Amino acid sequence: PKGCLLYGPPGTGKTLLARAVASQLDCNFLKVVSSSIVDKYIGESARLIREMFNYARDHQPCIIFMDEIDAIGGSADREIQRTLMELLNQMDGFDTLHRVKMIMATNRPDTLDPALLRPGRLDRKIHIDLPNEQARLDILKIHAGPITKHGEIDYEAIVKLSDGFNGADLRNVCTEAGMFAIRADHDFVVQEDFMKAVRKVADSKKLESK
Amino acid sequence: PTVTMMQVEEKPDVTYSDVGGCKEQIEKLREVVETPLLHPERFVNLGIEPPKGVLLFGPPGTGKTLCARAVANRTDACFIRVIGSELVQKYVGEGARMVRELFEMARTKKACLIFFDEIDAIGGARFGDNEVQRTMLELINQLDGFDPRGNIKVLMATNRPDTLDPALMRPGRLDRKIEFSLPDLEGRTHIFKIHARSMSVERDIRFELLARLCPNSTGAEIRSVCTEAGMFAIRARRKIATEKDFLEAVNKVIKSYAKFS
Amino acid sequence: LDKQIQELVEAIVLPMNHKEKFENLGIQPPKGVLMYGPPGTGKTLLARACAAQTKATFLKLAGPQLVQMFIGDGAKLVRDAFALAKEKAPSIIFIDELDAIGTKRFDSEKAGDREVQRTMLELLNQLDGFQPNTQVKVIAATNRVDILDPALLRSGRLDRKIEFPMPNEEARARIMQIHSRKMNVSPDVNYEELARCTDDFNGAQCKAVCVEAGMIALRRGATELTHEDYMEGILEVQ
């Protein structure tokens, strides 16, 4: 697969996974701006996309991130569609693509150019959805690692009482409860602050989850 | 170059009596340039940091004369002024070590007052401009920044208020932005009152009469009136100046020169 | 409004010298704090009121400074600021007007962001792949949160969304009380009438009122600042 699609319609969570592996090694770095198309000056950004992605072709290993690609999923949109034609004629272009890689991220899978949603170019797609009682438990068990806890351990009320979220909101809320545990400056961390603080702060993230 | 030692203005010159009708504004700017000199310790006893400076801008009028005023009235130690002509020069970047060495001379001259004229030379960048961005951002870091001191005198004189960055960066340190308010119908008689120490003036001359028939005749043009008075007094071999003698020079220098301007 | 100065003093002081507890309870130092909201609160003046409480190495840095004429200055300033920040001890540096350069627009009528947001995304690379980032903190503040990058939702990135709910005049008499507790003022200050008179004013405008009170105090006859010179300054400049 030479392309992936990451749409977390509830909240987010793709940026900490792409940030997990990419922050781990990523083997390289290359970033494409979501607003790299407005082009106040003359509309000659095509040669600079050929230059940038030509440098990506110059590097044998390469991973390219395109975060928030729903902004260009709509002469305002004319040059946007010109950069989209650069995407078409540079992914399906003429180059040895046996080693390059790229990852495209978005927010909502509704305005993602169903003409671009044609398979072949976007080979991979992973929908991050409501709690399946497995992924939230796994991500909770791996986020509970670096944080310290007491002997009393509970997870059913944390997976059950936190809905509509992912590992990103669970990371910010669990680490928020940990910051309440450092606001209690004790030598242990009982999960009472996790139940009440993850409950209330998670409800605040449900209020401001827009 | 030799401008670094030319920054000193010895040989006192025009005194307080060239105020062009700004009887209140001369206090609204004297309060920072000359008031903190009589009793500097009492401002420290007040608790507040001594004032920084004011902003003079707008029309030219009789500009650059108030610096001579600040030279004559300051009878202790003349100050340093920095005209904007030394900023716009070939091989930019000299103004950094230049402002650091005139600040060094300011610390060597027991807190010498520093003046900055003609900000419109590099003002209004509206971002070849990066070399100007260095001189103006470093200029803000040396003037608006408290690096030398929040102290005695900072001021910018100009003919255009279009300065983008200094207008939004002055209120933190600087204050008291006032217009120039060039003299009209009530200041030219006082510029004649300071020109009373020129060539002998007959008591028949009425300063208001010579100062009311000359619209748009600030200190420069009436300074040329008092110059052509003695000049034609030499061309006519006159011993005393009288307005009825050089009235042709007056209405000539204002009318014959106001036809095309 | 003391929870936004106390929450900030905590959020910038505790990640400085609590490494012992950071290794006793496994807590990471807070990095991202969003001091957004309407003007008047003086995010730069209050960030100076907290930076003075820290007194660390402060370096100037604004939002639209990335907008230049030539190429190569953005990486020089980002990698220079994180070169001295990455080299020296952990300090405190406050920036402002982050939304002026981190704003995306569907309409392509007029916007830059090519190298401003490509260099800004190089800065977000230095905050994206650099886990040893426990060094010098970069406090960010915006003037409006209408448009915001959805990728900025993280504990290391902007999380402490501090809003300004039109602070009361008493809060302006608290930050103005800190900005006026140094002068030799006669100890008759209720702060209530002079707080109530300072309506719809900014922080630098209140400091201009205090300076204006410090101007005529020489010619008022008394060497100690009085109570009526504050309202005299209010009616004087504004």
XYZ file of C-alpha atoms in Angstrom:
709
model
C 0.000 0.000 0.000
C 1.349 3.391 -1.104
C -1.329 5.422 0.691
C -3.417 5.374 3.848
C -6.512 7.231 5.049
C -6.972 8.134 8.727
C -10.441 9.469 9.615
C -11.293 9.664 13.317
C -14.779 11.234 13.084
C -15.200 11.187 16.895
C -12.479 13.349 18.417
C -9.029 12.344 17.195
C -6.351 9.729 17.859
C -4.498 9.312 14.571
C -1.964 12.020 15.466
C -0.661 10.081 18.484
C -0.240 6.892 16.428
C 1.407 8.605 13.462
C 3.208 10.603 16.158
C 3.997 7.342 17.974
C 5.743 5.566 15.095
C 6.865 8.798 13.419
C 8.173 10.107 16.735
C 9.827 6.709 17.228
C 11.826 6.448 13.993
C 9.791 7.413 10.864
C 13.044 6.668 8.960
C 12.755 10.271 7.657
C 10.536 13.346 7.904
C 8.561 15.334 5.337
C 5.483 17.465 6.014
C 2.913 18.940 3.618
C 1.005 22.007 4.804
C -2.789 21.845 4.734
C -2.906 25.493 3.581
C 0.004 25.329 1.122
C -2.278 26.204 -1.817
C -3.625 29.743 -1.197
C -0.621 31.113 -3.122
C -0.942 34.889 -2.822
C 1.689 35.242 -5.561
C 1.447 33.899 -9.118
C -0.018 30.405 -9.355
C 3.284 28.608 -9.957
C 3.304 26.343 -6.892
C 3.154 23.279 -9.162
C 6.888 23.481 -9.884
C 7.554 23.717 -6.136
C 5.472 20.596 -5.535
C 7.522 18.941 -8.286
C 10.626 20.213 -6.485
C 9.562 19.086 -3.002
C 8.171 15.696 -4.018
C 11.129 15.468 -6.403
C 13.363 15.695 -3.335
C 11.136 13.035 -1.771
C 11.885 10.977 -4.882
C 15.577 11.770 -4.374
C 15.496 10.279 -0.878
C 15.045 6.514 -1.143
C 13.165 6.145 2.180
C 10.419 8.694 2.711
C 7.179 9.024 4.678
C 4.946 12.023 3.952
C 2.207 13.254 6.291
C -0.810 15.193 4.981
C -2.813 16.122 8.075
C -6.310 17.624 7.801
C -6.839 16.844 4.116
C -10.579 17.605 4.300
C -9.826 21.311 3.815
C -8.793 20.621 0.211
C -11.641 18.121 -0.235
C -13.965 20.724 -1.719
C -9.920 31.008 -8.324
C -10.231 29.613 -4.801
C -10.740 25.883 -5.428
C -9.174 25.975 -8.911
C -5.562 25.854 -7.715
C -6.715 23.466 -4.980
C -7.809 21.109 -7.752
C -4.470 21.860 -9.429
C -2.610 20.557 -6.378
C -5.034 17.622 -6.422
C -3.979 16.972 -10.020
C -0.402 17.146 -8.747
C -1.376 14.439 -6.253
C -2.905 12.317 -9.024
C -0.074 12.817 -11.538
C 2.566 12.396 -8.815
C 1.179 9.286 -7.092
C 0.129 7.591 -10.345
C 2.949 9.371 -12.206
C 6.244 8.001 -13.510
C 8.638 7.010 -10.713
C 9.962 3.904 -8.969
C 7.591 3.750 -5.986
C 8.872 0.502 -4.447
C 10.274 2.282 -1.363
C 8.447 5.605 -0.867
C 5.519 5.980 1.527
C 2.934 8.601 2.451
C 0.139 8.945 5.012
C -2.948 11.135 4.571
C -4.983 12.264 7.584
C -8.395 13.932 7.752
C -11.234 14.639 10.192
C -14.580 13.740 8.580
C -15.189 11.124 5.829
C -17.961 13.126 4.151
C -16.196 15.841 2.123
C -13.154 13.820 1.022
C -13.616 14.161 -2.765
C -15.348 10.849 -3.650
C -13.519 11.196 -6.959
C -10.301 10.936 -4.933
C -11.809 8.194 -2.742
C -11.429 5.889 -5.770
C -9.292 2.919 -4.614
C -5.769 2.162 -5.806
C -4.368 5.460 -4.554
C -5.851 5.247 -1.035
C -5.207 1.571 -0.337
C -5.455 1.651 3.473
C -8.157 3.105 5.714
C -8.825 2.552 9.425
C -12.031 3.877 10.988
C -11.623 4.770 14.670
C -15.118 4.391 16.102
C -17.194 4.005 19.278
C -15.766 1.894 22.136
C -15.748 -1.754 21.075
C -14.704 -2.736 24.653
C -11.402 -4.048 23.225
C -9.439 -1.164 21.693
C -10.215 1.172 24.600
C -9.147 -1.542 27.047
C -5.892 -2.183 25.174
C -5.079 1.516 24.752
C -6.029 2.007 28.408
C -3.694 -0.790 29.518
C -0.836 0.690 27.478
C -1.517 4.249 28.677
C -1.658 3.015 32.288
C 1.977 1.910 31.961
C 4.006 5.095 32.476
C 1.538 6.393 35.089
C 1.613 4.896 38.577
C -1.412 3.389 40.310
C -2.425 1.898 43.647
C -3.180 -1.741 44.427
C -6.888 -1.150 43.827
C -7.353 -1.361 40.046
C -10.576 -0.879 38.078
C -11.161 -0.580 34.332
C -14.799 -1.508 33.602
C -16.094 1.831 34.902
C -13.385 3.667 32.935
C -14.112 1.952 29.615
C -17.860 2.151 30.280
C -18.032 5.679 31.718
C -15.854 7.120 28.910
C -17.625 6.898 25.547
C -17.265 8.650 22.213
C -13.504 9.008 22.714
C -10.250 7.378 21.585
C -6.699 7.005 22.862
C -6.069 10.727 22.376
C -8.945 11.949 24.543
C -8.287 9.054 26.927
C -4.633 10.125 27.030
C -5.440 13.767 27.801
C -8.106 12.803 30.349
C -6.088 10.063 32.068
C -3.016 12.308 32.180
C -5.341 15.056 33.420
C -6.352 12.812 36.323
C -2.653 12.126 36.846
C -2.080 15.873 37.035
C -4.784 15.867 39.698
C -2.783 13.122 41.421
C 0.190 15.504 41.385
C -2.232 18.188 42.580
C -2.782 15.855 45.557
C 1.023 15.437 46.052
C 0.745 12.078 47.822
C 3.139 9.128 47.571
C 0.502 6.901 45.923
C -2.177 7.306 43.247
C -5.517 5.661 44.009
C -7.946 5.211 41.120
C -10.588 7.306 42.903
C -9.073 10.368 41.228
C -9.172 8.338 38.009
C -12.879 7.534 38.347
C -14.046 10.974 39.483
C -11.463 13.028 37.577
C -11.662 10.946 34.399
C -15.456 11.003 34.775
C -15.847 14.765 35.222
C -13.010 15.814 32.904
C -14.259 13.302 30.327
C -17.709 14.892 30.606
C -16.102 18.297 30.047
C -14.420 16.871 26.943
C -17.862 15.651 25.861
C -19.179 19.196 26.311
C -16.227 20.679 24.383
C -15.835 17.706 22.020
C -16.880 19.734 18.955
C 33.364 57.843 10.574
C 33.572 61.465 11.741
C 29.795 61.572 12.270
C 30.271 59.654 15.536
C 32.151 62.654 16.940
C 29.893 65.053 15.028
C 27.027 63.716 17.174
C 28.159 66.189 19.857
C 26.608 69.658 19.472
C 28.740 72.277 21.226
C 28.553 76.050 20.600
C 25.080 76.773 22.085
C 22.313 77.996 19.803
C 18.592 78.904 19.627
C 17.035 78.976 23.106
C 13.546 78.392 24.539
C 12.132 81.532 22.898
C 11.556 79.755 19.508
C 8.418 78.020 20.808
C 5.927 78.164 17.951
C 2.764 78.711 19.973
C 3.104 75.355 21.766
C 3.083 76.900 25.233
C 1.490 73.744 26.674
C 3.114 71.165 24.385
C 6.569 72.506 25.279
C 5.707 71.431 28.827
C 4.189 68.158 27.580
C 7.625 67.349 26.111
C 9.906 69.405 28.370
C 8.523 67.326 31.259
C 10.700 64.423 30.071
C 13.702 66.107 28.398
C 14.429 68.938 30.865
C 12.305 68.356 34.000
C 14.143 65.163 35.119
C 17.418 67.146 35.117
C 16.809 69.613 37.963
C 16.035 66.982 40.635
C 16.626 63.450 39.316
C 16.757 62.020 42.850
C 13.235 63.230 43.664
C 11.761 61.080 40.889
C 13.521 58.105 42.487
C 12.029 59.193 45.821
C 8.607 59.241 44.134
C 8.973 55.497 43.482
C 8.051 55.567 39.788
C 10.654 55.023 37.096
C 11.627 58.316 35.421
C 9.738 59.010 32.188
C 11.005 57.722 28.852
C 10.032 60.233 26.172
C 7.392 61.685 23.881
C 6.606 61.506 20.150
C 6.712 64.543 17.854
C 5.398 64.085 14.314
C 3.028 65.499 11.722
C 3.902 68.558 9.647
C 7.510 69.788 9.378
C 6.860 73.401 10.344
C 9.774 74.657 12.446
C 11.126 71.170 13.117
C 14.667 70.475 14.363
C 14.640 73.833 16.190
C 13.390 72.254 19.430
C 16.611 70.225 19.569
C 18.597 73.470 19.543
C 16.193 74.643 22.250
C 17.108 71.499 24.201
C 20.787 72.358 23.644
C 20.612 75.939 24.929
C 18.284 75.244 27.860
C 20.435 72.275 28.946
C 23.287 74.328 30.402
C 25.004 71.269 31.938
C 26.041 68.889 29.135
C 24.825 68.876 25.520
C 23.099 65.722 24.255
C 23.378 63.393 21.256
C 20.929 63.378 18.345
C 20.745 60.666 15.680
C 19.378 61.821 12.324
C 17.864 59.236 10.001
C 20.289 60.163 7.216
C 22.918 57.913 8.840
C 20.629 54.855 8.739
C 19.899 54.668 4.989
C 23.456 54.107 3.748
C 25.367 51.664 1.579
C 26.617 48.492 3.291
C 23.860 48.325 5.894
C 24.604 46.917 9.342
C 26.885 49.698 10.591
C 23.989 51.156 12.594
C 24.172 48.268 15.067
C 27.720 48.944 16.260
C 26.979 52.652 15.765
C 24.024 52.640 18.157
C 25.994 50.409 20.538
C 28.930 52.841 20.495
C 26.742 55.926 20.925
C 25.001 54.090 23.760
C 28.493 53.350 25.081
C 29.260 57.066 24.793
C 25.936 57.701 26.539
C 27.119 55.563 29.461
C 30.501 57.327 29.318
C 28.961 60.834 29.421
C 27.150 60.276 32.767
C 23.741 59.420 31.298
C 23.787 61.627 28.226
C 20.428 62.222 26.560
C 19.942 60.466 23.215
C 17.752 61.737 20.368
C 16.586 59.948 17.208
C 15.503 62.054 14.223
C 13.957 61.039 10.888
C 12.530 57.590 11.572
C 10.894 57.730 8.116
C 14.231 56.856 6.474
C 13.805 53.142 7.254
C 10.242 53.352 8.556
C 7.337 51.793 6.718
C 8.927 48.546 5.567
C 5.577 46.842 4.818
C 6.979 43.320 4.560
C 15.859 43.634 0.282
C 13.762 44.303 3.374
C 15.396 41.708 5.647
C 18.538 43.837 5.934
C 16.181 46.611 7.047
C 14.338 44.175 9.329
C 17.639 43.607 11.143
C 18.241 47.319 11.743
C 14.652 48.061 12.792
C 14.079 44.941 14.904
C 17.445 45.504 16.573
C 16.431 49.169 16.827
C 13.323 48.096 18.750
C 15.435 45.729 20.862
C 17.753 48.634 21.767
C 15.177 51.438 22.170
C 11.892 49.800 23.181
C 13.916 47.119 24.937
C 15.079 48.104 28.414
C 18.653 46.987 27.644
C 20.373 50.412 28.070
C 17.791 51.647 30.608
C 14.194 52.823 30.859
C 15.674 56.292 31.259
C 15.907 60.004 30.435
C 15.121 60.489 26.742
C 13.856 58.529 23.755
C 12.131 60.334 20.900
C 11.295 59.965 17.209
C 10.737 62.916 14.870
C 9.290 62.410 11.395
C 7.071 63.850 8.672
C 4.878 60.749 8.220
C 2.910 58.918 10.950
C 2.765 55.760 8.762
C 5.164 53.857 11.082
C 3.573 50.428 11.506
C 5.739 48.754 14.163
C 6.751 51.751 16.350
C 3.100 52.800 16.673
C 2.120 49.397 18.103
C 5.366 48.976 20.079
C 5.685 52.401 21.744
C 2.800 52.192 24.296
C 4.708 49.630 26.361
C 7.672 51.937 27.011
C 7.045 55.283 25.287
C 4.025 57.554 25.736
C 2.678 61.070 25.093
C 2.192 61.093 21.324
C 1.365 64.692 20.364
C 1.086 66.535 17.063
C 3.563 69.173 15.918
C 1.049 72.073 15.884
C 3.065 74.447 13.729
C 2.744 78.151 14.640
C -0.126 79.980 12.929
C -0.757 83.691 13.584
C 0.521 83.462 17.173
C 4.005 81.917 16.977
C 5.672 83.895 14.203
C 5.639 87.014 16.392
C 7.553 85.011 19.016
C 10.037 83.728 16.444
C 10.429 87.441 15.755
C 10.898 87.842 19.517
C 13.880 85.482 19.296
C 14.985 87.225 16.082
C 15.056 90.469 18.088
C 18.745 89.750 18.814
C 19.567 89.932 15.084
C 20.674 93.056 13.204
C 19.437 96.213 14.947
C 15.631 96.318 14.899
C 13.907 99.694 14.791
C 11.077 100.030 17.312
C 8.690 100.914 14.461
C 8.451 97.241 13.445
C 5.285 95.496 14.634
C 5.890 91.754 14.907
C 2.163 91.022 14.597
C 1.903 93.072 11.393
C 4.859 91.209 9.869
C 3.465 87.930 11.261
C -0.178 88.178 10.117
C 0.181 88.765 6.348
C 2.260 85.574 5.905
C 0.218 82.349 5.817
C 2.157 79.074 5.996
C 5.330 80.892 7.053
C 6.841 78.739 9.806
C 10.298 79.270 11.324
C 12.130 78.325 8.131
C 10.415 80.791 5.793
C 10.361 83.681 8.269
C 13.928 82.694 9.134
C 14.626 83.380 5.459
C 12.710 86.644 5.928
C 15.057 87.705 8.728
C 17.957 86.476 6.575
C 16.957 88.453 3.473
C 16.293 91.448 5.739
C 19.967 91.727 6.650
C 21.036 90.517 3.207
C 19.143 93.279 1.402
C 20.276 95.566 4.229
C 23.803 94.854 2.991
C 22.706 95.250 -0.637
C 21.122 98.614 0.268
C 23.810 99.726 2.772
C 21.232 100.135 5.541
C 22.315 100.501 9.164
C 19.066 99.424 10.881
C 16.473 96.874 9.791
C 12.911 98.118 9.284
C 9.987 96.103 7.925
C 9.019 98.990 5.629
C 12.408 98.570 3.911
C 12.407 94.810 3.221
C 8.632 94.457 2.821
C 9.452 93.753 -0.830
C 11.644 90.905 0.416
C 8.756 89.685 2.588
C 5.950 89.653 0.019
C 8.514 88.586 -2.581
C 9.758 85.600 -0.574
C 6.208 84.536 0.366
C 4.229 85.570 -2.736
C 6.713 85.246 -5.609
C 7.767 81.936 -4.026
C 4.202 80.906 -3.121
C 3.048 81.233 -6.745
C 4.754 77.989 -7.813
C 4.571 76.428 -4.332
C -9.765 36.512 38.420
C -6.958 34.751 40.294
C -7.307 31.218 38.881
C -5.809 32.285 35.528
C -2.727 33.837 37.127
C -2.410 31.063 39.728
C -3.098 28.305 37.192
C -0.453 29.890 34.953
C 2.121 30.403 37.720
C 1.614 26.730 38.558
C 1.653 25.631 34.908
C 5.008 27.381 34.363
C 6.686 26.968 37.785
C 5.926 23.332 38.619
C 7.497 21.931 35.374
C 10.703 23.763 36.349
C 11.890 22.276 39.658
C 9.516 19.369 40.433
C 11.511 16.727 38.533
C 11.812 14.774 41.796
C 8.038 14.311 41.905
C 8.031 13.879 38.119
C 10.118 10.750 38.752
C 8.284 9.794 41.959
C 4.813 9.700 40.359
C 5.652 9.405 36.650
C 4.308 12.836 35.659
C 5.384 14.725 32.530
C 6.077 18.482 32.598
C 3.212 20.562 31.186
C 4.243 22.284 27.960
C 1.202 23.618 26.100
C -0.947 26.356 27.619
C -3.364 28.404 25.493
C -3.747 31.908 26.949
C -6.337 33.026 24.409
C -9.303 35.383 24.719
C -10.189 39.016 24.051
C -7.713 41.845 24.723
C -7.682 44.009 27.840
C -6.388 41.234 30.078
C -2.861 41.888 28.814
C -1.568 38.411 28.009
C 1.862 39.948 27.391
C 1.675 42.104 30.526
C 0.407 39.219 32.661
C 2.863 36.838 30.993
C 5.453 39.403 32.091
C 3.918 39.363 35.580
C 4.551 35.595 35.644
C 7.860 35.670 33.764
C 8.983 38.111 36.457
C 7.948 35.480 39.009
C 10.156 32.994 37.136
C 12.900 35.464 36.093
C 14.276 32.966 33.569
C 16.028 33.755 30.281
C 13.415 35.579 28.189
C 13.823 35.997 24.425
C 11.430 37.949 22.227
C 9.401 36.044 19.637
C 6.165 37.028 17.877
C 3.729 35.305 15.555
C 4.082 37.104 12.215
C 7.889 37.230 12.524
C 8.064 34.238 10.160
C 6.713 36.452 7.356
C 9.883 37.709 5.655
C 11.086 38.780 2.202
C 13.858 36.241 1.529
C 14.018 32.499 2.172
C 16.012 30.797 4.913
C 15.264 33.179 7.790
C 12.461 31.070 9.268
C 14.671 28.039 9.860
C 17.382 30.362 11.191
C 15.017 31.830 13.796
C 13.275 28.566 14.731
C 16.479 26.515 14.884
C 18.238 29.482 16.496
C 15.584 29.901 19.198
C 15.629 26.148 19.836
C 19.405 26.142 19.400
C 19.873 28.487 22.358
C 16.830 26.968 24.071
C 18.062 23.443 23.305
C 21.591 24.335 24.455
C 20.975 26.378 27.613
C 19.018 25.609 30.785
C 15.203 25.319 30.765
C 13.761 28.835 30.705
C 10.492 30.666 29.958
C 9.694 32.392 26.652
C 6.269 33.830 25.797
C 4.986 34.378 22.255
C 1.836 36.095 21.023
C -0.421 36.210 17.952
C -0.038 32.530 17.102
C -3.410 32.484 15.318
C -2.188 35.177 12.901
C 0.042 32.537 11.264
C -1.670 29.260 12.206
C -4.983 30.006 10.485
C -6.186 27.882 7.567
C -8.769 29.193 5.111
C -10.998 27.440 2.594
C -11.100 30.645 0.531
C -7.852 31.168 -1.404
C -8.449 34.907 -1.888
C -5.430 36.024 0.168
C -3.183 34.005 2.495
C 0.468 33.039 2.781
C 1.417 30.132 5.072
C 3.653 28.423 2.471
C 6.942 28.964 4.309
C 5.268 30.557 7.337
C 3.349 27.333 7.978
C 6.019 25.141 6.395
C 8.539 26.596 8.839
C 5.826 26.612 11.508
C 5.313 22.912 10.753
C 9.070 22.511 11.084
C 8.579 23.929 14.580
C 5.720 21.442 14.960
C 8.223 18.836 13.773
C 10.527 19.872 16.624
C 7.446 19.480 18.850
C 6.296 16.393 16.900
C 9.233 13.973 16.931
C 11.435 15.323 19.736
C 10.550 13.429 22.918
C 13.536 15.021 24.798
C 11.529 18.283 24.586
C 11.428 18.517 28.444
C 13.728 21.526 27.916
C 12.740 25.216 27.550
C 8.976 25.769 27.367
C 7.323 27.884 24.666
C 4.146 29.539 25.946
C 1.692 30.308 23.137
C -1.265 32.699 23.085
C -3.799 33.652 20.414
C -6.268 36.496 19.937
C -9.054 34.281 18.539
C -9.830 30.565 18.390
C -12.163 30.633 15.387
C -9.713 28.621 13.249
C -7.391 26.128 14.932
C -5.302 23.195 13.734
C -7.022 19.975 14.921
C -3.579 18.351 15.310
C -2.813 20.686 18.248
C -4.808 18.502 20.687
C -2.229 16.905 22.988
C -0.831 17.187 26.500
C 2.487 18.495 25.191
C 0.727 20.847 22.774
C -1.887 23.477 23.650
C -4.209 21.921 26.248
C -4.733 24.527 29.003
C -7.297 26.622 27.123
C -7.412 29.709 29.342
C -10.277 31.966 28.251
C -10.721 35.618 29.220
C -14.375 36.041 30.370
C -14.222 39.861 30.241
C -12.272 40.261 33.508
C -13.944 42.490 36.080
C -12.531 45.896 36.979
C -11.327 44.391 40.264
C -9.012 42.093 38.301
C -7.715 45.167 36.468
C -7.122 46.643 39.934
C -5.233 43.451 40.837
C -2.899 43.445 37.835
C -2.831 47.234 38.187
C -2.229 46.740 41.914
C 0.831 44.678 40.986
C 1.729 47.336 38.402
C 1.344 50.044 41.074
C 2.626 48.431 44.307
C 6.142 49.803 43.667
C 5.577 53.572 43.681
C 5.528 55.690 46.844
C 1.747 56.100 47.016
C -0.152 57.454 50.007
C -1.776 54.424 51.693
C -5.345 55.553 50.939
C -6.299 53.300 48.020
C -9.642 51.486 48.124
C -9.156 50.278 44.506
C -12.956 50.318 44.185
C -13.604 53.809 42.815
C -10.426 53.801 40.720
C -11.229 50.241 39.648
C -14.772 51.257 38.688
C -13.393 54.241 36.758
C -11.106 51.947 34.710
C -13.757 50.501 32.403
C -13.038 49.104 28.923
C -9.318 49.809 29.402
C -6.272 47.716 28.555
C -3.338 46.751 30.744
C -0.894 49.073 28.994
C -3.565 51.774 29.195
C -3.736 51.284 32.968
C 0.059 51.489 33.119
C -0.239 54.698 31.098
C -2.692 55.922 33.743
C -0.195 55.056 36.483
C 2.652 56.770 34.616
C 0.403 59.792 34.052
C -0.113 59.834 37.815
C 3.679 59.695 38.062
C 4.072 62.703 35.748
C 2.439 65.655 37.540
C 3.263 64.363 41.038
C 6.322 66.637 41.006
C 4.247 69.766 40.331
C 1.406 68.734 42.664
C 3.487 69.846 45.669
C 3.590 66.471 47.442
C 6.415 63.965 46.992
C 3.988 61.087 47.708
C 1.406 60.081 45.108
C -2.157 60.896 46.152
C -5.501 59.221 45.472
C -6.958 61.810 43.074
C -4.037 61.633 40.625
C -5.148 58.182 39.449
C -8.575 59.415 38.349
C -6.859 62.586 37.130
C -4.798 60.302 34.907
C -7.880 58.346 33.816
C -9.685 61.522 32.757
C -6.357 62.846 31.433
C -5.313 60.227 28.876
C -8.679 58.443 28.596
